[PDB]
Design a protein around this nucleic acid. Sequence first.
DNA 1: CGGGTTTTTGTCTGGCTTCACACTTGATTTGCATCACTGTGTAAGACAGGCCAGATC
Length: 36
Amino acid sequence: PSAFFLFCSEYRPKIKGEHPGIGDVAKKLGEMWNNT
DNA sequence: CGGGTTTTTGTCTGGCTTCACACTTGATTTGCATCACTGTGTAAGACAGGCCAGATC
């Protein structure tokens, strides 16, 4: 486990509520994680 | 020579499981080339005994 893995496991429901479908969801997650 | 008998070949409707990108990134191990350092088989390389012929009193 790493910081990115923890952030993903913590904010996956965010992308879930945002878009159902997870290419674009994971892309946006990685983008916002690299931004923050 | 034509017909019969297996044998294999599929059908839609509706219903189960089941492996694969898709990014996501950043560690992990995986693999081939490189590094340190000698022992040795092998081929170049003089080398002196032997065999000579040219030579002098």
